[PDB]
Structures are given as structure tokens and as C-alpha cells.
Amino acid sequence: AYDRAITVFSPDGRLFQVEYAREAVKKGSTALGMKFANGVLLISDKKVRSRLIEQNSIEKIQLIDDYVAAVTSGLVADARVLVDFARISAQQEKVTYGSLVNIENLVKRVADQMQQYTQYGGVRPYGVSLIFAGIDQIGPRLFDCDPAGTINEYKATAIGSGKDAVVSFLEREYKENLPEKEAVTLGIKALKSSLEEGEELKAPEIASITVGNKYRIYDQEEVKKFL
Amino acid sequence: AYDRAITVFSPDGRLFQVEYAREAVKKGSTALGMKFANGVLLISDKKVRSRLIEQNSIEKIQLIDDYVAAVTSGLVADARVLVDFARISAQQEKVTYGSLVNIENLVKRVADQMQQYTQYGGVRPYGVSLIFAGIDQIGPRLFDCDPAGTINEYKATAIGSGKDAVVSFLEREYKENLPEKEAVTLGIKALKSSLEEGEELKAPEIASITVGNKYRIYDQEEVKKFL
Amino acid sequence: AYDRAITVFSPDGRLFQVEYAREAVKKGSTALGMKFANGVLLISDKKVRSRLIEQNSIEKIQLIDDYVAAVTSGLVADARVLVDFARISAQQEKVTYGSLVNIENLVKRVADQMQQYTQYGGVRPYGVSLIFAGIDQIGPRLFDCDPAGTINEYKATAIGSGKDAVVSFLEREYKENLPEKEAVTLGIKALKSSLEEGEELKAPEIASITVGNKYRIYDQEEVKKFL
Amino acid sequence: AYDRAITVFSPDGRLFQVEYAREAVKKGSTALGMKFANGVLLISDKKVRSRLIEQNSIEKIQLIDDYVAAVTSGLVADARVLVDFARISAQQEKVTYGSLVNIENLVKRVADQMQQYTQYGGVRPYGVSLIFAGIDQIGPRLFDCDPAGTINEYKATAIGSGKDAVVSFLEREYKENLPEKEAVTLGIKALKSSLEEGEELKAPEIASITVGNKYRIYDQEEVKKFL
Amino acid sequence: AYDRAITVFSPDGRLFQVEYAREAVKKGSTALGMKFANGVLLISDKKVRSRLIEQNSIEKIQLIDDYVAAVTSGLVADARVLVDFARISAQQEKVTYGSLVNIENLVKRVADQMQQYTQYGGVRPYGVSLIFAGIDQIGPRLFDCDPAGTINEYKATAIGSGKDAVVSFLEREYKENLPEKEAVTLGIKALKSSLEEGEELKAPEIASITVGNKYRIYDQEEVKKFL
Amino acid sequence: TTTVGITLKDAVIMATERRVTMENFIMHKNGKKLFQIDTYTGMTIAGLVGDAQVLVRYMKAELELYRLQRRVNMPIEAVATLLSNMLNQVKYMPYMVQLLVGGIDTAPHVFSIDAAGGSVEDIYASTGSGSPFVYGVLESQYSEKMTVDEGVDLVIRAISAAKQRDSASGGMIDVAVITRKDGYVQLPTDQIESRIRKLGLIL
Amino acid sequence: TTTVGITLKDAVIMATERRVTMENFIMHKNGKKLFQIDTYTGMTIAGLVGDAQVLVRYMKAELELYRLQRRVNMPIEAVATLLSNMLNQVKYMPYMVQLLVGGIDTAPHVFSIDAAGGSVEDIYASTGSGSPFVYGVLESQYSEKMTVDEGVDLVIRAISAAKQRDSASGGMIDVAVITRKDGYVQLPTDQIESRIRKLGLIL
Amino acid sequence: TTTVGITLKDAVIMATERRVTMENFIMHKNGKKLFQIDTYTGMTIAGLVGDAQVLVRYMKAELELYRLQRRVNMPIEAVATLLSNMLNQVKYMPYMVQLLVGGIDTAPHVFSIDAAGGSVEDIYASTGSGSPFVYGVLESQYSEKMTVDEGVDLVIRAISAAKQRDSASGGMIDVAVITRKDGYVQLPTDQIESRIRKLGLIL
Amino acid sequence: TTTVGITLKDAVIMATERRVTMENFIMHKNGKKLFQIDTYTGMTIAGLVGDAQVLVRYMKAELELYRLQRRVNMPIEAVATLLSNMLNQVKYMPYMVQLLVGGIDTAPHVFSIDAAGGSVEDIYASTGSGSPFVYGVLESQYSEKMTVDEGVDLVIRAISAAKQRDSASGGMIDVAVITRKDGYVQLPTDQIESRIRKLGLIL
């Protein structure tokens, strides 16, 4: 009915095509991000499909530069095209202005790219949500972006399948300005609260930055210390 | 039937697609605007989705410059694209003419952008209404704009879910040339008359300007003084 | 059937889509225009939706310049886009030729713009009729233009909901070369003959021009003198 | 079936969309044209919709230049767009060649414009037939052109509702090289033979041209002399 | 099913839309062409719709230059557009090369124009077959071209309604290198063998050329000598 | 070349020489530089020949299309504004021409247009190579209280002075008087020779 | 050519000469260089004629469209900014003109715009060939405590000095005073001749 | 090079030399500069060779397409107007050529077209390097009361004078007479040598 | 023209002259060359007037749009990088201007940009015609241990030296001090005249 085209509103004024693209997000792995004292971090689960897969390859935390990073969930091909568009947009802003002063417009350019395909006929939306985390001249920023293009800045969030659970636990447990070790411990406990027990958390990716420093990926052993 | 394309009139000459886009406006938060003595104000409710949301972030009152401001209701992604188009259009008029002398043509450029997508196939309308408020060289102006593109200048209005309530209370209670404190008190009472009792008004946003001054956002405590 | 596309003739050779756009015209307010001795006038009813509406704002008589004016009926967003296209076209003719010698080609450019969208797929027609009135070097001209693009020059006409009734009253009562006061009195009586009795005529707009003069809007008190 | 698109042949190889556009011609007023001794004439009936219409306005005989004239039947908005295209095309040929040597290629350019829209998707045909009449360096020419684009040169013809009747009477009564008064008398009798008796012919338009002269519109009294 | 679009093959790999455009050809008048001793001729029947039609006008044999000629059958508006495209293409080849050395590439350019519209969506094919006849530097050439674009060079052929009958009689009676009078007599007998007896052949058009000469239309009396 | 246009009481007289060169080398002893551009207005040519004939074709076409679409003639201010916009839309591939368009609508006018499209009114004007001579004699003898006959005599005396004192002008003078009553009427060459032999300018 | 514009207490006076050349060869003894551009502001012309008349047509059109869309007049800063952006969007196929636009909105203004589009305010300005002379006399005699009559007398004395000491200027001076009360009023030629004969500048 | 075209009573005679250079260095002692452009009209060439042959190909094509679409020949005013619009649509990558097109429709004509596209009628015309010589002899000997034989004798005397007194012209003269009765007929070289030996111009 | 910008301890002082010429012929005794470009940074102009005013309009627009979209001011390195990319995207239809943008974000800065878009920092800079004079006095007297009052006295002494020893500069000096505490404050002309009369530079 009001259902099989991006350019058709419902009688209640809804785009079911966009909300179906939002349903595509819920099939991805759970990732989270949170602000802490002078910094911000990202944590991400991974499907380990087999033992023949490379570990040290396609990773759910992607750097956008040395001062913006991002995690994705949804269709992985769309997500890779999005992260590469975000990287090109960041480098264009660096050519034009010498530096990236607000992450929010990098998020806005990515989200306007995503909104543009919820409107014109002959394209489909992007079935991906993203979380951006980084330092700019305002401070630590943390965003999410969704198939509609809606931008939200948060203290902490998730995306993916266990998102609701990870939100609800943070809806009981998150505090501002934690030290970094405590913030990661809270994040790992949050990610464990989304699993269905019996099932156990294999080694997740964690990135983080503090103000005045550059980027920092935990290697797997530093992650093992918190499991 | 006459129903699933923007380019098809009904046998009564209606575009149901546009009115369905107007039904998207009714799902947003209630905002209002009103003129007072030498000035104009905007008040807006907010959905506070969770406690993990940032307060000091994406806000329902948006500045278009230092001498035009706006509130939106409807699809938030479309609304953000609209506010950014309005900002770029205002800055283009400032490059061309040195100043913004009438807000009405900024509203007209935004509304022609909205009307253009109620006509051409392969695009959908914008499911957003806007209220513009500001000072120009004519005086205090206050507008609304809708998914059809229809422009109206008012003394006072609302948009959003509780619009029909907030208009009706103003249809009993609005007077011209109130002092600013009385006008804001009338607006807060108007916004409370749209709630379903038991449910109480959390902290809303209020902006306002008087002639010869610049912009002025109330912080939260100055808002608390009227609750 | 032959029904849901602008580019499809019926087996009798009709475009039902265009005639549905003509049915859109009948939902607007009634306006009329008539020629009198060395001049021409326009009269227009208005929906006053509430008491919170601005009176001194969006008006049904619009100036196209100092020597062409126009009233509209139908979709108001389409009608505003049309009046602005007419203004830009009049100013283009003034840049090219120094003056506007025949109003008829301004009407022809607007009507060709309207006819162009009764033909190409992917656009809808304009659901608006217009009446143009003014002085040119031929004399007083008075036109109407419709969603098909059909141009007709008249002694007197109406557009809108009560159109037929008004036309029928002029079909009994109109005479050429009346003085301006008698012509406006005939027009007000014509507009009253389209109402359903009990319902009474609130303050309408009236504009008029005589040869060798410029434009002239009656203010509300001068209109009250004829009610 | 084979029915609702211009770009689809029937199993017999017919375009029903084109013939439906030809059915639009039959709802127009009857006009005729005929050759006589060193000249050619056009006669046209008119719908007089009301007494409030201007007589001295939109006329069924239109001049294409001081040596080509034309009458139309069908969709009147399309017909006016066609007559204006024919005028622009004649003036382009006069720019290029200094004069119009053959009317036939003016007719061919109009007919190719009409044929181009019986082929490409997303446009509809032109629901108008035209008769061209004039003097060129070959002699008096007389044509018709139809929604398909088919050109025919004749001694005498009609278009419109009574076309068949006006053809059939000429199929008994037309002779070459009549003097002009006899030819117009034959044409008025032909136009009267298409009416349904009781209904009487009000004042029609007649134009005529002879070799070495420009056009000559009969005024209404010179027409009254033949009624 | 596999039926209502030009771009859709059948499960047997047929284009029914093209073959329907070929069924359009069978509703036209019968024309034939044949080679004879150092020359080639064309003969064509005509519908004489009424006695009011001009004889000396739109003719079924059309010259493409002084050294290529053609006859058509099918949609007459399409056929006229085709003959004019063939004339422009012949003149382009004469600009480029100084002369027309092979008629076959003129036929190829026309047939590629016809093939191009049996492939792209949004256009229909040309419902016309053509026969080209002339002298080039190879000798006398004689072709047909169909809505599919298929080119065939022949000794003798027909197109139109009676085509099969005219082919079958030539399938019994045609010899090479006849003198011209005998070849025309054979063609007239062939054209009479396609009629349904009782119905008699009114005056047809015949053109012909011999090597080293130019073009030569029979007038009507020279045709009457063979009836 | 030389042109002349005079506005007087209810008429406007425009006349040219007829000698076209196109080289140094006078080549055509009978050209055409006075064009009727519409049933009540005419145009004179004083520039490069080909560009100006293209201009005359375009203005005939546009004014005829105008009269057809509006059932009234174009005003003289409108045709000069149109001609100025045409010449000024392209001035870096420019037309090297000096146009002079005269005519009557409700009052007589003669407007001058340079190569850059500066339309300007004057009660008498002249363009071309032998133009300052006719400006001299029209400065010395012209009065606005003239009739049509005194006007056309003044015009023939002017162009005769320009033919006597300039190389580029010459040939048989042709004159057209445009008035509201009789419309646009170009004088036959017999009356022109009659006025030349009467005024004592023949040699 | 010469133009002059003076801002005084609540008024602005703009006047020009009327002599257009278009050659060396002064050709039109009565041109038009003072244009009303809107009901409370005017514009003066001191450059190439055709380009400047195109500019006047465009600015009349844009300001009339503005007043129609907004139901209020355009400010003077806005019209000079618009005119500067117009001249500076194309400067490599440039307009060779010196524009001077004056008018009153809530305070009188007269702005000068060069060929490159440098809008700049001044309390009195002048453009054209005979411009340094009127800058001399306006440097020596102008006071901002003048009335309208002393102002228009100063303006006529200025343009009379420029007509006396310059070849390119000349012809009959035309003056228009634009004030907020009576609007834009152009003085008739009888009052201008009266002030010329009164001030002892007639010869 | 040299061309000549003469309109007389009911005929038009056009003749050229045949010597093409293409360098200083005369290179082709037998070229072709006289082209039949349609069954009743012809065209002569006096410019750059390649551009002019492109022009001849285009005009043959356009006039043949015209005769096919309209079943009648093109008038001479129409072909000169067409040729002028063609040369004047591109004049900044211009054709350096001087065209001369003659022919008969209901009255004989010969029109001259310069490189800028200035079409102009004359009763006799000539183009090319050795053109002023044939203008001299056609100014001295031509009368419009001639027959066809006196006309073609005048033409051969003209081109013989141009061959005697000019370097760029030369070679065997070719002449074509176009009349309404017999159409376009180009004289064979035997009759041309006969007229050369008869008129006492052979050396 | 002359500009000057000085970075000292927690402030930046930028001042210009006000005399615009636009000809040789100094024309405007009170221009405007010191522009506030954002609530904590300003820009000075030392080139062609029209191009530079277009630059000021564009930079006001872009920085206001920036502050609106990001709720924070733009850094000075970012605005100079933006301005350099703007001037260097078009340098073959170039802007002939010398820009100097100063301001404070967390530390004061004043950056110089040439016509080719070479942004470079310096603790004091100057542009314009009378620029080497103020570079001389700022080389001789400037110390980075100054206050705001000693700084603005140094600036007025500098521009007074440039007004004394240069033709292109002149007019009334205008100065604006931008600091983080009080923001961007332009000194009124009364305090400027007070410092001129105090420092013994008035004549």
C-alpha cells in the first residue's frame, strides 16, 4: 500500500520504507559509546562467523581521522561506503578550514547524505546506524545517526541488536566523569547485560580518547584484563 | 486510488499525499509563538525520551541568524534539513543585499522549496511545519509554514500535537502589546492547556526578542521561575 | 482508468486530471472583477478562519505591478507561486521592452506555464484560477486563467465557490460604463447574491484603477460604506 | 490494455491514444475553409457561452502573419499554444529566408511538433486540429493538420463537431474559382447545413485573402449581410 | 503479458510490439516496385477518400533526391517524418562525400533510425514500411525497410494491404530485364490481381528511372494508357 | 554613408543616400538603407552591411509577431528599448552599426542607437560617414514650425550637401515620410528628382 | 558628463547636465541622466550610455519587484549593495560606468559606486567628466546647515561652473530634490531657469 | 581571381577565369569557380578555395532539399538571404570569401555577398582580385538593351581585359548563360574560343 | 591606504585610516576599511574597494553561518585558511587585495593574506600603500610587554607617521581593540582625538 516506495507518505504521515531501513539496523552487532572524564570511548561486539576468519581485519571501530572515530551497525556494504564518505568529508573540511573544529558538521554532512536518499525516487535508504566519538574544540562529542538521518548527541548509547538492553542498563548505571577504567568496566558490564545468559562475551573492540591526546585502540590483551 | 502519488489530483481536486504529509506534523511536540509589545517570542515543549539524552542538545528553537529564529514540528530529519536550508538562504540574502529587511521572503524561499516537492514526481513532500519569529525593518514578524508551502503571518500560533488546544486557549486569551513577562506567562498557560492533566510540563525552551536588541535564549532557571 | 495520469486522453478525448484540477478551484473563496467607465475593479471575499489570524496579511488581491493586478482561487501554495511567477514575468517584459503594452501576453506567459504542466508526465497541474485586471495601452483589460491554461477576456466575472451565482447575477444586472461607485455597489450586491442567506458578508477586499492613474486599494472603512 | 500509453501499439498496429486525441477535436466548434478564384477564405462558428463574454475577443480565426491564417478546434489551451508556436515558426522562417515562400513547411513544422508528442513517453498528444489558409508564391494554399500530425491540402474542408455534415454538403456543392461573394454564400449555407434545425446561426467569423493582398477580417455587419 | 512494452522479449524471444507495428503496415495502400532493363520503377495505389480531396497532393511516391525515390505504407504521419529524415540524410551524405554512391547506406541510416526505436523504452516503433528505388554507381537498386528495421534488396516487391497477392503474382510472372513498357504493364496487372473483383483500379502513381537519366513521374494520361 | 531623420509637427521624415561600399572602391550605386520596419515606423542603417541587414530582418520579424499577438502596433520607445537590449546583449562580439529608428504612435519620434545600445531621443538625428554635414545644415535651417514639404526640402538639401562634401555618400537619394494620416509612404524617384531640379541642387 | 548629489538636513538633491556624446561630436543636446529608481530614491549616470541604461532598467525592475513582495521600500544601503554585487559579478566583461544613487529612508544618503562595485557613502558626491570642478565648489561653499533652497542654488552654481569649464558637460541642467515629506519631486525647467537668472549664471 | 555577372533583359550571364592559386606560384591552370547551384541559378567564387567549396556543397544541398520539399525552385532573394545568414552566423571564425549568386525566377537577378554577409542587388557585379578592370569596362560599354550575344561578348571582353592586366587571373575563361527559356546552359569551350578569335582578343 | 594590526599580551589592536581613492583624485574623506568580521575577530582592507567589500560580505556571512551551526566562534587559523582558499580558488581572474585578519580565540593572533592567498602569522603586520612607514616605527618602538593603552598609542603614532609621509593615506584614523574580556570594542572618535592631542601629533 503506502509501503513499497520511499516517496510515499502513509495516511498518518509515516515513511514505512525508512522504518524498515531502521529495522535493518537491529540485525547488527551491539556497539556502545560513552563519555567519561575528559574523554570518550567506544566498545563493540563482533560476530565471529568461523575460525577461518581473520581476526585482525574488518573491524567495527573505524577511524575517521586522528580526532574522529566511528562504529556502525546494519548492512555492512552500506556501512563501509558510509565510513569512507565520512573520511572523505573530514578530509575536505580539513583542506577547507585547516582543522576540524566541530564533529557535529561531519555528522551533519553524513546525515544529510543519508537523508537525501530518504527522499528521491529510485534510490533506497542506507540501512546503517552510526556512532561518532571524538574530541573537538568544544570537548568530547558522542553522536548517533540513523537511516532517516536523525542526529542525536548523547552521554552514552548503543546501536545494534542488544541496543535496548544496553540502553536500559545505562538507564540505571551511567554516571558522568568516571575515570577511564571504571567507564570501560561499566561498558563491558553493559554489553554483557544484553547477551542471553549461557552465551558469553568473546573479545570485543574498545577505542577511546582523552583531551589533548590522539587515538588509542586497546589490543586484545588489554581487553582480556576486563573480561 | 488518487492516493499514492504526489502528482495526482483527486476528483475533488485534492492532493491526499500533501495532507498525509500534514498528518506527519501532528506527531511532533507542541510549540507556540506570539507577538508582544515591541517583540516576539517562541515557546516549545520537548519529548525527553530518556534520562541518558543530553539536555543541552538538539533543541527545538533554532536560530536562523541574529535576527530570525525558528521552531519545527514533524519529521526531525526533514526539519533539520529545512533549518539548514533556511540558514543558507538567509546568508545568501545577506550577501546580496547587506541585510535582511523582510523575514517574509526568507519564509517565501523556504516555502517555495517546500512547494516544489508537492509537484514534481519522484520526490516526497517535507513532513514538517515551521514557525519563524524575528525582527525586521517592518517590525516583529511571526509566521508559520506547512508541508504544502502555505505561508501565514500571525499574532500567535502553535504547531504540533496540542496545536488545536493551544490555538483555542489563545482564541480566548490573547491580547496585543503585553509586556514580555505577561506574554510568556500566557504562553506557558497555553502550553499547559494542551496537556492531558496528571501529565505535567517539564522544562520547555523559550526564546524572545525585542526591537533593537539581539537574540535571547532563556536558560533553564529563568524558565523554572514560570512553571 | 483514463483517470490517474496527466498524459492520458479519455476515449472521448478528455483529460480528467485537468478537470479535477478545475474542481480544485471551486473550493476557494469567491472573487469577482468588472470593467467600468475608463477603469476596472476587483472584489474578493475571504475566509476568516479565526480571530487570531492577521487581517492585514495574506490578501486575495495581489499587485503584479503598478499597472497589472490579480486575484486567485484554489490551492493557495500554488496560487502564491503563480503570482510570484507573474510578477517576475512582468518585470522581465519591462526590462526587455521598457513598459508593459499588453497585459494579454503577461496572461499568456502565465497560462503557458500552466499549460506546460497539463502535458508533461511527472508534474501535476496547477489547481488555481486567476483573474487579471489592469490598464494597458489598449485600455482596461480583465482576464481569467484556469488550470487548463484557457485564457478568457471579459466584461465581468467571478472565480471561486459562488462563481456561477455571481455570474448569473451579472447575467441579469451588468451594464457597461458605470461610474465607479455604482460598479462597486453592483459587485457587492453580486457577491451577496452568492451567499446562503443568514450568512452575511464580512469586510471584503476591493481594488480599482482608472485610466491614467495608478493603483488603489480601498481600506476597510471605505469598504464598510458599501456593506 | 493497448490503451493507456502513447508508446504502445495495438495488435492491429493502432494507437488508440492518438485516436482518442482525435476525439477531442469533435467537441469543438465547426470551422471551414475553401479556395475560390485567386483566393481562399475561412469561416468559423462560435460558442457564445453567455452574454457577459466579450465579443471582440478570443477569436477562432487567428492570423499567423499578413499572409498565413489559421482556425483551430479541440482543446483551446493546446490550440492557443499551437497558434503561438506557428507564429514563432513563421517569424523564424522569415528571419532565415527573408520571406515565406511555401506555407506547407510552416504546416510541416507545426505538424512535426504535433507528431513528436505521439511518440515519446511522458507527454500526451495535442488534442487540436488546425486549418491553415493563405497566399504563398505557389498560390492559394489550404491545409488541415490533426493530433496525429497528418497534413492534408484541400480545396475545401471543415473541422469541429459538424465537420462531416459540412464536408458532405461540400461533397455535393463545391465548385472551383467562384467569385468571393458566391464562395462565402456557399460556406454560410454549408455551416447552416450542420446545425440541428430550430437552432439558428448567430454571427460567425469570416476571413479571406486574394492574391496580391493582405488579410481582411469581415466585421460583424458585413457578415450580417449574408445571414 | 509479454506484450505491452517494446523492451520485453517473449519466452520464445519475440517482440510482439514490433510485430504489431508490422500489422500497422497492412492497413495501407498497396505499392510495388520492380527492376527492369537498366532501370527501376515504382507503382502505387491510392485511397481516394472523397471527391473534395486534392488529386495533385500528398502523393505516395516521394522523391528523396534526383537519384533516390521512395514509397511508404502504414502510419502516414510517421511515414512523412521518415521521408523527411531520409531526405535530410541523403543531403548530409551529399555534403560529406559529394555524391550518393550507394543507396544502401541511405537505407541503412533510415533503418537504423527505425531500429533504434525498437529498443529503448519510452518510444514506440515506426508503423511504416518503405520501398526505396533508384540508380547509384552499382546500378539500379530496390529495397524495402520495415518497422523492425530489416532491410532487403529485391528484384520486385510490394508493401501494403494487397502485398501477398502482388508478391504471389510476381512469384509467377516476373522476368528480369524487361523493357519499360512491359515492366509497367506487368506491374499494373500485379496491382489488379490484389483487388477484389468488381472493385476496379482508379488512376495510380508510377515513377521510374533508367541509368544515366533523372527522375520521371508519369502524369495521369500516360497512366491512363495502361488501364 | 549618411542617414537623416526629422521629427516635425505630426510627421517624421527619414531619408538616406544609396551607395554601398563594402570596399573603398564604391561597388553598388543603388543599395537599400531605408527600411520600413512596421506599418507606422521605419529604420535606417549606417554601419556594417551584413550585420545591419540581419538586424533589419530580426526587427521586422519581432515587430510583426508583436502586432499579431497584440493587435496593435509597438510604441517607438519599446522598439528602441528592444533594439538596445539586442545590441547590448552582445558587445564583445559586437555589431559595428549606428541605427536610427523613427516613427509615429501618438506623437512623432526619431531615436538614435549607437553600437553599444544607447537609445536616446532627439527631434532630429543623423548617422553615418557624411553625418556632420547634415547636422550642420539642420542646425542652421531647421525649424519645428515646418510643414511636410518644407521638411522634405530641408532633408534633400541636407543629403545634397553631404553628397557634395563626402566620398562615402552618394548615389540617388531616397526619402520616406511617415505620418499618422497616410501612414508610411515612400516618395517615388520622380518627385525626388522634381525637388532636386526645383531646389537648384542638380548638377 | 557631470552629476552631483548632496545630502543635507532631511533631503537629498541630485542634478545632472543633459548632453550625450556617444562620439566626440556632441550629438544629443537633451539626454536623460537623472532617473527615479523608486518612489523615494533616484540614480544618476556617468558612464557608457547603453550599459547604464540597461542598469537603470534592471534596478527599476528589481526595486519595483522588491516593493511589491515586501510592501515597503528598499533601504539605500541595500540598493547600493545590490548594485555593487551586480557590477562585480561581471568585471572581466565589465561595465564602464560610474553610478551615484541617492535617496532617503529614515535618514538621507547618497552613495557612490565605481565600475568595480565599490559602494561608499559620502555626504556629497559627484561623478563624470566635469566632476572635479563641482567637487571644488562643493568643497568651498557647502555647509550641512543649509535649507533646500540654498542647497539647490549650490547645486546649480556647481553644474554651471562645470558647464563653463568643461567640454563634455553642457546642455540644460535638470535637478530633482527627494525628501521624505513630499517624496521625489523633479523641478520643472521654469524654476531652473528662474534660479539661473536669479543667481547671475545666465549668458 | 575574377568573376563577372550581368543581368540583362531576360537573362543573366556569369563567367569566371580558371586559375587557382593557393600559393603565389600559380598552381592549377584549370580550376572551377563557376558552379550551378540549382536548375535556374548559379554561384561564383572569389575567395579562399576550401571554405568556398564547402559553401558550394552546402548551398547545393540546401537548395536541392528545398526544391524537393516544396516542388518549386528557391527565389534569388531567398538564396542570398540564406547565404548571408550562413556567413554572418560565424564571422569571428570567419569565411574569407566574396560570393556572387545570379539567377532568374520571374525576373533576372545577380546578388553580391561579401565576407560579412551583406547581400545587395545590382544589375551587374564582379568580385575577385582582377575585379576593378571588369568594373571599368562594364561601366564604359554595358547597356541594358543588349541581347544575349552582345552580353556574352561584353563578358569575354571584360575577362580578357582582366587577364591582360592582372597576375592573379588567367587561364581559360568559362561562361554560363542562365535564362528562363533554355534554363542554365554553360557554353562549350569551342564557342568560347570562337568568340575570342572573333573579337580579336586572342594572342 | 594603510592598515595596522598588533598582537600584544592578551589583546589585538587593529586600526586604519579612512580615505578612499578609487581615482588619483582622493574622493571620499571618510571611508570604512576596518570591519568586524565576528564577535571576537576583525578584518582590515588594503586593496581594490569593490572586491574587498565583496570579501567582507562573504566572510561575515560564512562566519555567522559557522557560529550558528556550531554554537562556537571560528578560530583565527580557520578563518585565514578559509580566506586563503577563497582567494586561491580564483587567481587568474584574481582579487587584487591585501587582507589582514586579527582576533583572539585562546591567544591573540593577527594574520596577513596576500592576493595569492598566502596566510602567514606575525606578531604585528601592516598592509597598504603607506605600510613601510608603520613597519619602520613598529620595528623601532614596539615591545611585547606593552599594555593596551601603550599599544593604541603606538598604533596612532604609526598611522600618524604614515599620514604625514604618504599621499594615498589620510583622513580620520579609526581604531578597534579586540580583547577576550570586553570583546570587540571600537574606540569612539572622541578618545582618538584625545590621544592625538595628547601625543602631540595634531596639526
Numbering used by the authors:
A (entry chain A), B (entry chain B), C (entry chain C), D (entry chain D), E (entry chain E): 7 to 233
F (entry chain 1), G (entry chain Z), H (entry chain 2), I (entry chain Y): 1 to 203
What does the primary publication say about this deposited structure?
In archaea, the 20S is composed of homo-heptameric α- and β-rings, and PAN (Proteasomal Activator Nucleotidase), a homohexamer proteasomal ATPase, is the RP found in many species. Unfolded substrates enter the chamber through a narrow pore in the center of α-rings, where N-termini of α-subunits form a gate to impede unregulated access to the proteolytic chamber. We designed and assembled in vitro various asymmetric archaea 20S, in which one of the two α-rings contains a point mutation, K66A, which prevents RP binding to the α-ring. Our studies reveal that, upon binding of a RP with a conserved C-terminal HbYX motif to one α-ring, the gate of the opposite α-ring opens allosterically, resulting in similar proteolytic activities of 20S singly capped and doubly capped with PAN.
PA26 is a heptameric 11S activator from Trypanosoma brucei. To test whether the HbYX motif is a required element for inducing allosteric communication between the two distant α-rings, we further determined the structure of the asymmetric CP αWTββαK66A in complex with a single PA26, which does not have an HbYX motif grafted to its C-terminus. As expected, the gate in the proximal α-ring is open and there is no rotation of the α-subunit, but the activation loop of PA26 is engaged with the reverse turn loop of CP. This result suggests that binding a proteasomal activator without a C-terminal HbYX motif to one α-ring opens the proximal gate only, but does not induce allosteric opening of the distal gate. Indeed, the peptidase activity of symmetric CP doubly capped by PA26 is about twice that of the singly capped asymmetric CP, as predicted from the structures and the stated hypothesis. However, when bound with PA26, which does not have a C-terminal HbYX motif, peptidase activity of doubly capped proteasomes is greater than for those with a single cap.
